[PDB]
Amino acid sequence: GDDIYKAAVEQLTEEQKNEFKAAFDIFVLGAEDGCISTKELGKVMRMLGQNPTPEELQEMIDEVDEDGSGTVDFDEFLVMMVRCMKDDSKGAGAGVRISADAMMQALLGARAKESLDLRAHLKQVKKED
Ligand SMILES: Cc1cc2c(cc1F)OC[C@@H](NS(=O)(=O)c1cc(C(=O)N3CC(C)(C#N)C3)c(C)[nH]1)C2
């Protein structure tokens, strides 16, 4: 069940979508539909500093895929990206776990700081002390 996560993307801020967007550019490198599949994911995952398997890879894509087409778009990446950094995507299953912050370091790099969570800065018509 993904009701809270799927909604998380909505809570995100304009800066968030962009911060993560730049990552998809590299994450979907070569992809025909700019989506992340077993091929693309396998490339990045390996570059992150690990050595996953082709069978497990597909499990991740579908594990995050909302429709289950076989790949992940820019939106399907945010839904998981939220829980990825929160480390609450699985809870307590297996040691296997991808780092959201560490991932960006591969795609874009160190171009993701507090600014990423601009949502906290100010995205409404109000102010407090
Ligand atoms: C398309 C997409 C999906 C996911 C991505 C990043 C993406 F690009 O990252 C998070 C992933 N969910 S997960 O539960 O962390 C997770 C990690 C793994 C895995 O194969 N391994 C971790 C490993 C490298 C080790 N040790 C082996 C599995 C099976 N689930 C789902």
Ligand SMILES: [Ca+2]
């Ligand atoms: Ca899909």
